[PDB]
Amino acid sequence: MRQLAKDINAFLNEVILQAENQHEILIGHCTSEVALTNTQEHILMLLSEESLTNSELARRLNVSQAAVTKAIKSLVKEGMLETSKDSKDARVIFYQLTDLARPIAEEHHHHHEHTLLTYEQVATQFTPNEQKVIQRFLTALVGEIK
Amino acid sequence: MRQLAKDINAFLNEVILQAENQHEILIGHCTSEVALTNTQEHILMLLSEESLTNSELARRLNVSQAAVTKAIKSLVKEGMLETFYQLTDLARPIAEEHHHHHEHTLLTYEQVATQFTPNEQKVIQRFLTALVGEI
Ligand SMILES: [Zn+2]
Ligand SMILES: [Zn+2]
Ligand SMILES: [Zn+2]
Ligand SMILES: [Zn+2]
């Protein structure tokens, strides 16, 4: 058996461990001045863009409506979200960010960018030809996992 | 930005999705005729090998002691474990199935690796190590 087979198993183990039960991996520490859960921040990021329903948020976040419901209630309660109505949105009423939430959504967005840039750093340690090999590997691996 | 950077992010999300709550990914269906969580099966597998404290199990799976303990209490309630904790006869085929599932998983990764040359495999190895190093 090739060493790589064992490396793949250990790698997947490490990924899951690093995910810390969150629905996503982000590189480095959150820098927000208000401590919201990762899921809460991600919601603020998404809603800073799309005015989604709690049901649509749950599908994207891959969680239960209940969890989203709890997240939203907390966000409304903590003054991160408020109800609103305006000509730019078809919805009769939706949750939009308050001024307090703006920097949070922005920070979480920056955190996603930093995460992608980190993978960019990793990718560029390899030649374009080598990157292609790594691409083929991820495709074959993900094909067996799903 | 290199597309590979985005592919990496997409891949990690898929792994996390596939590992729903579990501490590990396994390939294919669990063929146990019993509806235990993956963590429960894994704990049975380990205890089928040797007696371990809940603290030790937690270090083995890299999960909280709370996670291990809850799994154990359920296993006891389902008649899989008894007082260290030791397997009952009901649990034995399950621990065996979970071990076979692991073997099948490694064999699948072997099949993946052998789609690449020895030199290509090294590249992929360096990649895995570099990626984890940054996480
Ligand atoms: Zn943050
Ligand atoms: Zn996020
Ligand atoms: Zn199983
Ligand atoms: Zn296992």
UniProtKB/Swiss-Prot annotation, chain B:
Zn(2+) 1 binds at E24, H42, H98, H102. Residues 54-77 bind DNA. Changing H42A: Strong decrease in zinc binding. Zn(2+) 2 binds at C30, E41, E97. One of its GO terms (molecular function) is zinc ion binding. SMART domains: HTH_ARSR (SM00418), HTH_MARR (SM00347). The second zinc-binding site seems to play no significant role in the regulatory process. Its function is unknown. Zinc-responsive regulator that acts both as a repressor and as an activator by regulating directly the promoters of its target genes. In the presence of zinc, directly represses the expression of the adcRCBA operon, of genes coding for a group of surface antigen zinc-binding pneumococcal histidine triad proteins (PhtA, PhtB, PhtD and PhtE), and of adcAII. Can also activate expression of adh. This is Transcriptional regulator AdcR. The lineage of its organism: Bacteria, Bacillati, Bacillota, Bacilli, Lactobacillales.
